[PDB]
Design a protein around this nucleic acid. Structure first.
Ligand code: ATP
Ligand code: ATP
Ligand code: ATP
Ligand code: ATP
Ligand code: ADP
Lengths: 362, 362, 362, 362, 362
DNA sequence: TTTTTTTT
């Protein structure tokens, strides 16, 4: 009779679809008789088999239309507008909710019908990291609180240690868990400005290890970067909004994000020391390294670097109540998986090997 | 009466033609008398001679239209939309089985009654290839599966070595096999982005003989590509979907494809070396030179460059079971045809001549 | 009564016009009475006087149309589509065969009943070219085969020799013969993209007198041409499809054409030297200066730099069977014409005149 | 009742207007009654007063139109299309003959009952110009021939010698005599892409005041025009079609025009020197200066800069036969008008005063 | 029951608006009843209250239109078209005469019965300006003739004198009297390209604050202004057209307008000095300082900045025959008003009183 | 929108 633009836009919202070509492509598939549709029969894609029957009648009429792309364009605008309306009104925790939500929806892929890897050696990495320092389970949820609360000045941690402390590898896992971006400070002041603009609207950041003048006595490479840092004062504080330099575009100005920093054992000014919520402190504990010499697969699957290992760790150790109300109901079912799939004695044996420097699976 | 955009699009889908000009041009040929059509009579191009009889009536009406380019637009979009929907809803495995079917379809024609090239000339290429490196098929199979798995970080291989070592030649055959793209990166960075646009929805990518810098005392002019690459490391990871770009079009959020790289032997930043799965060396060889002066027709016909040679090679060397179940029937059918065609004496006589470097066929 | 867009499209196709403003301007001329048409009466241009009477009735309606630019766009798009269809489906021999037939049509006009050009002045041009190099005739035939075969990494000829050696001139004649374009690579990288865009869907490219560096020892002003070109090793090799641009147009993927590089005598890095297949020397010969200074009709009519003189050279010298099967008869016909209009002794005299450095005619 | 677009296209053709705004703005004036049109009754502007009463009724309906800019767009397109057609089909001789015709209309108007000029003032300018160089009128004739002939590589004239020697004054007169525009090439190289875009479809070019190096020995201020020119080597040669670019436009491929280069006594490289036919060294001659001091009216009215001055010179000195055959009728009539007014005594009076350094106008 | 596009265009022409958004917003205000319109009632802006009552009805229909921006575009086109026609067809004297009428109109408001401004304070303005230089009112008349005649070479004036000696004040008032724009030359040459784009279609330019190289000779600050200038000898002398450019616009060509250069006591080459018609020396005179320090309404109301004050100065001092016949009537009416409102003794007293450095108006 | 601009 004629195409209902209404029904096309419903599907776009329903499927959260926001590519005009994908929307066109998928909606076109409904034009055959769902009554016999082989995808419906095999229930291969929910984005098809949940919808075909309702949309079929409209899809037959859509297939004949000479306006097809324009119908899909309006539909996608509705979905982009919905994101933009919502984006204006997120709490910081709601961001974190979604960041994690999507990682949970990735973790399916690791083990399920895709089955890309093994939840076992994943948990072996979880065991391997937990031993490095106290109570890592709590430490994550503590850092997490800080990044939602975003309390002025009370917003930053310093990972000080030697070189080869592991802090970079941890930093990878943290940023991998939480999002954000990494950034430099070891530049001529001249050049630096645009690098600072890279932060624009990241939730979180990490700063790369900064070349402390005179450090080469410590045999730590030494120079401009720390001189730059303390001149960046108010960016840390988050007291007031601040201008940001995009290349090839004009200024934007906003509250600078909270985040993380990395440090060899260089000199630190009192002023610079004063900024932090804490130092957290890292060193060689080489039986762990010899456990790695016996656990090499964790580097190969790269699980040791994994913020997903952190996600798994919280999913284990912490109270279900400790998660945000709704997504609690997801942590339940991963625990239901994990905790029957893995006893304490299993996790124990693993941690014992690591603590003994023995290969974690030995 | 009135153009059926339906029948236009149906031709576009069935040819997989995906350019408005190429579609526009070819469809216009159909406006003339099929009963007299010299192309149909001489069965010159199947993309014509099959379809003309069916499309003729509509093509005459199309030849009158004032809308012509707009009709071709909606047709071509249906082709891309189908591609992109498959680019999500297929496994990479099923993608290759689809790709292999299409190449097998070409082979069936090329050595059919049309038969327009000698099987033994084409096979002589396979000898040259499995002669270039040992275990050639086996490394080829290893590369293929690495590209099916596409597992993050372990997504890139390097070819490194001097001029005329053959590395370019091999990449061409793999790329003709796998259906990827080459990309050029010896270029200004803030102008490069649309090069990555080309990678949208592709299976695989190749980077060709990038300008490094330093060691140019060896007469190797320096350039920026290595800096560009390690700056662009964020793509190589396969970490998370990135929003790729194309002019006057909506951006395309996707995982960046895996790929392979070729290099005359500049320095690498060890960080840039840190990205790879593997290196392979390549070595100019006089005997593999001298043979071509006689066997010139191989290179004239680009045989040793072309992925059809690889497919014939894998059909030769590999177990039927190594191919996916879906295609294994055709693998049997084609093994039988190679088994019919050749004695090992023929094959080994040639491979002997190839080792001599003269008189490959004798 | 309405415009026939079909008549416009046919006109554009038949004249191979592919510029919307040329088409627009040309078609408007036909709005006047063809009987009174002084251009027809004079027979100024064939693209007019063959057509005016036939298109007159439609041009009178076109002159009133409100749509004009849109109609012309469609007609031009049809011509463009034909080129793309041809480019993908014809063998390179057919492309050259078609290009040869066209030049032979011009020669049917230039030396037609009008006698509009002097066949003796044109033939005189051939002799001066023939003395430009050793075995000139062979050198042309070799070059055509090379371009038609389009063999990987055997695709480029280097013309090298002093200022005013003749190399630019020989390139220019070959370029017209095959059809293709010149490109100025000395410009800076940021605009080279659209420079290379020129080459899309062309038979040859010519790179002109690229600047090297350090030859200012010899006062050869340095420039980036050589450095620029060594970014583009990939393009010369013809081994993989490259991505080409136009403004407000998405990239086109295809193989980069073969061609010629002219060269005042800067140095060459082996990466680039490896990619040429043949270097040809050129030298000042004062007696050619003395001849040209007394034979200046050669330059005024651009005879020696034009392509048609090379075709006449081929006709004078090659066995007919060396021409592609279809044109062989037209070659027989022109051979007879030339053999009739000139003796061999006349040609010997013309060569001798040039050898003496006297004006070509006595 | 509706707009005649044909009447607008006539006006655009008639005025040869090719700015949509200028066309629009003028056409809008015709909506008031010619009967009262004070511009008509002042009879000040030809492109108004000739036409108002014809277009009147259509201008009133155009005033009410909702489409106005589209109508003008089609009209300007037609005038533009006319130029492109002509730029292929005309000989350079017909072009020059046309350019003369238009200047001759302005000469008829200027010295008409407009009263608007004193031919005695303009003729004094001819005496000044003819005094500046030996054999001045033969120099103009030789230059005009050179531009009509456009012999490859033999295309450019180089003007040298001190500042304030009138070289740019002379260049302006030739540039107004022909069609063409000037360019400034001492620019940043990357901007130069759009600078050369100005040359598109024109007859002459003048490169204005190229700066070299070494001349700063005299403190000729140093610059890079010389080195920039030497990159445009193929543009000077005019041997093959170069690629030319405007903002937001795809390149048009075209033979770059012939022209003039003006400079002080910097050096020129071999390669660039080789590309000039003729070198004119102007010299300071203070009797000319003291004449001009007492001859202020020349520069006040821009006489000695102006191509109209040269044209009066040619009509004086050159035989009637030297003009293209069509205009010889008008030329004879203007020769009569000159001699009817100026006795040779008057011209000898003038040249005598100039030679004396006396104010010319006895 | 339709929008009259004509009434909207008449309003745009009437107000001389040429920004579509400024045009749009203002017209929509008329849709409310003018009869209670507070903007009418308060008599805020003439551009509103003159027209609200007239366009009310058409604005009421306009407010419902779905076409609104499309209407405004055609309206703005009309105003730009008027400027474009005027930009070619008027004498420089006629341009200035139009400019003067606008200032005279604005004076009728400022000093009206609605008069926002004290004509007595503005007369104090004229006193302080008349004190600033020798021979002031004859100096202005001579500057104006110079800009109107625009005689080549002899086009430019140089202001110099100490810091805080009035030079930019006078320049800004002259710039406002004529219209024009200021320019900054003290740059690296790359940006200088778009700087000059400002000058397109201006009647005047001012080169402010030209730094001399090595001005610390005087102990002035150094800068490249002078060395940047003297490249541009064509631009000042204005005998010939120059290419001019704005961001995102194709180049245009015109004579560069006449203007002023200002500086402190830097060096001037004779190469620069010969560019100038007159050099005006300013001096700090302390009674003016103490007068401003007792007459600050001058500064605070910006009186001595404003072109109106130079217009008033001309009206009071100059003979009527020095204006154009077009405006001589208005000049008489204003002269009558001022000669009624002020005695010669009273204004003579102000000049005497400013000579005392006491505040103007006691 | 791209392009041009920004950027070097
Ligand atoms: N191993 C080899 N031994 C000898 N000749 C070779 C070998 N491989 C390639 N060739 C010759 O070198 C030509 C170019 O090969 P190819 O482009 O693959 O080499 P490459 O090492 O990638 O070169 P480049 O670094 O210059 O691009 C081939 O066409 C063939 O003629
Ligand atoms: N072999 C020759 N001997 C003498 N004069 C020559 C010779 N070849 C060309 N000429 C003259 O040199 C002019 C320029 O020729 P051409 O442009 O082909 O030379 P080129 O070596 O390519 O120069 P360039 O590098 O400067 O462009 C010709 O027009 C002719 O006048
Ligand atoms: N031969 C001459 N001898 C003396 N004065 C001259 C001579 N020719 C020109 N003049 C004076 O030189 C003035 C400047 O002329 P013009 O701008 O054309 O000089 P130019 O030397 O060609 O300049 P540029 O090098 O800046 O292009 C003229 O207006 C005239 O007053
Ligand atoms: N002749 C003068 N005598 C005394 N004070 C003066 C005089 N002219 C200007 N002033 C004072 O100088 C201040 C600044 O004037 P103005 O901006 O025109 O100076 P300038 O020297 O032209 O500046 P600049 O060169 O920095 O642009 C005025 O506001 C006024 O206080
Ligand atoms: N417990 C440990 N014992 C010994 N070495 C360690 C330990 N943890 C980390 N390292 C060393 O740190 C090296 C680099 O890890 P990284 O995350 O980069 O630390 P950093 O950022 O401090 O350099 C590792 O290769 C490892 O040898």
């Amino acid at each position: 009779k004629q195409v209902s633009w209404k029904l096309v836009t419903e599907y776009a919202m329903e499927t959260k679809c926001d590519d005009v070509l994908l929307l066109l492509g998928m909606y076109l598939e409904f034009q055959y008789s769902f009554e016999m549709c082989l995808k419906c029969i095999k229930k291969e894609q929910p984005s098809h088999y949940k919808y075909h029957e309702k949309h079929y009648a409209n899809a037959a009429i859509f297939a004949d239309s000479k306006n097809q792309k324009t119908i899909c364009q309006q539909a996608v605008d509705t979905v982009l507008a919905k994101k933009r309306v919502d984006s204006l009104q997120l709490t910081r925790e709601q961001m974190l909710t979604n960041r994690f939500n999507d990682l949970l929806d990735r973790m399916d892929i690791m083990f399920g019908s895709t089955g890309s890897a093994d939840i076992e050696e994943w948990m072996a990495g979880v065991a391997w990291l937990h031993c490095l320092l106290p109570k890592m389970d709590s430490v994550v949820y503590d850092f997490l609180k800080c990044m939602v609360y975003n309390i002025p000045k009370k917003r930053y941690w310093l990972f000080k240690g030697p070189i080869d402390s592991g802090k970079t590898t941890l930093a990878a896992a943290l940023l991998e868990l939480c999002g954000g971006k990494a950034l430099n400070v070891n530049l001529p002041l001249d050049r630096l400005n645009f690098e600072l603009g890279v932060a624009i609207d990241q939730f979180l950041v990490v700063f790369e290890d900064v070349k402390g003048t005179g450090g080469e006595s410590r045999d730590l490479p030494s120079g401009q970067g720390i001189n730059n840092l303390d001149n960046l004062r108010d960016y840390l504080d988050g007291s007031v909004k601040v201008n940001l330099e995009k290349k090839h575009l004009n200024k934007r100005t906003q509250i600078f994000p909270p985040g993380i920093v990395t440090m060899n054992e260089y000199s630190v000014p009192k002023t610079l020391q004063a900024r932090f919520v804490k130092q957290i402190d890292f060193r060689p504990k080489d039986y762990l390294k010899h456990c790695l010499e016996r656990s090499e697969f964790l580097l190969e699957k790269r699980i040791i670097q994994s913020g997903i290992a952190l996600l798994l760790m919280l999913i284990w150790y912490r109270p279900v109540a400790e998660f945000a109300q709704s997504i609690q109901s997801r942590i339940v079912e991963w625990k239901e998986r994990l905790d029957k799939e893995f006893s304490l004695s299993v996790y124990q044996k693993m941690k014992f090997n690591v603590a003994m420097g023995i290969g974690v699976l030995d």
